[PDB]
Paper text:
Fe65 is a multidomain protein including an N-terminal α-helical domain and three protein-protein interaction modules: a WW domain and two consecutive C-terminal phosphotyrosine-binding (PTB) domains. Fe65 determines localization and nuclear signaling of APP and modulates APP processing and Aβ-peptide generation. Most attention has been given to Fe65-PTB2 as it directly interacts with the AICD and thus functionally joins the two proteins. Here we present structural and functional data on Fe65-PTB2 revealing the domain as flexible module forming a homodimer in vitro and ex vivo in the absence of APP.
Unspecific aggregation of Fe65-PTB2 at concentrations in the mg/mL range can be prevented by the addition of glycerol and we subsequently crystallized the domain and solved its crystal structure by molecular replacement at 2.6 Å resolution. Fe65-PTB2 crystallizes as dimer of dimers with a continuous central β-sheet. Dimerization occurs via a structural transition of the C-terminal α-helix α3 within one Fe65-PTB2 subunit (the “complementing” subunit) in respect to the conformation as seen in the previously solved AICD/Fe65-PTB2 complex. The last two helical turns dissolve (starting at L656) and adopt an extended β-conformation that complements the “accommodating” subunit in trans (dimer interface: 585 Å2). The newly formed β-strand (defined here as βct) quasi-symmetrically mediates also the dimer of dimer contact with the tetrameric assembly being stabilized by a disulfide bridge between respective cysteine (C661) residues. In the crystal structure of the Fe65-PTB2 dimer, the induced strand βct with the C661LD sequence directly matches to the AICD strand. Thus, the complementing Fe65-PTB2 mimics the interacting AICD in space and charge. In summary, Fe65-PTB2 dimerization results in a structural change that blocks the AICD binding site either fundamentally in the accommodating subunit or partially in the complementing subunit. The analysis revealed a pronounced positively charged patch (R605, R607, R657, K660 and R665) in the center of the dimer directly located at the transition site of the C-terminal helix. Most strikingly, in the elongated patch next to the dimer interface we find three adjacent sulfate ions.
Residue numbers in the entry:
A (entry chain A): 539 to 666
B (entry chain C): 539 to 663
Write the structure that this text describes.
């Protein structure tokens, strides 16, 4: 059920806004300008209904865990390999998680979108 | 008896059915994307046994008032912040009022749930 994607985890940075392609592009270029593919942490991203887990490539040790309910934005970068999403870690705290994917990041972004679309809503019939 | 909340009032739209998450999701998408974070009216919601009252946060001007007896459906959206309910607005008409809540819509969803319980208990007499 849960599917895992082989990625380079580029880390997470604080950002100024919860939404925007401008924000995730600037965040990615912060990582790409001072570190190469060799410095990035190879791992897996498991897209579960409630959580995204950044999880090591064979050992299965957790690098980070993000609840889908706090996800505020996601986008593939101007580079088709790069992918990022922003977590609303509170009222003014925003965090941007970044990834590099081979062959590209389209499959991983769609899995995170499906995770954000098929949510359980709380429902109540109040009729007589 | 009351519970009061600081939320954004996204307005109300006519809807096709008295119940439905399909009905409520389409209502929220109509307002979440055709309205911006600044043209959302900051509001004060007063939840009472008989009435839900929606007031402008400062001026306390009336943005809307809904009687609990006509509530037919309640729902939190796919977004945990959003909350909406459907009203019996006419003979065959239906209306959906929508809200955005911080940190989330749980406390507001409970208070409106408590109001419907008082009505459901009032009718069981």
């Amino acid at each position: 059920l849960v599917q895992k994607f082989q990625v380079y985890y580029l880390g997470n940075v604080p950002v100024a806004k919860p939404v925007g392609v401008d924000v995730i592009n600037g965040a990615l270029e912060s990582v790409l300008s001072s570190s190469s593919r060799e410095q990035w942490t190879p791992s897996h991203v498991s897209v579960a209904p409630a959580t995204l887990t950044i999880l090591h490539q064979q050992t299965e040790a957790v690098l980070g865990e993000c609840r889908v309910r706090f996800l505020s934005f996601l986008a593939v970068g101007r580079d088709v390999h790069t992918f990022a999403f922003i977590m609303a870690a509170g009222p003014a705290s925003f965090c941007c998680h970044m990834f590099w994917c081979e062959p590209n990041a389209a499959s991983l972004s769609e899995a995170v979108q499906a995770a954000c679309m098929l949510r359980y809503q709380k429902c109540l019939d109040a009729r007589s």
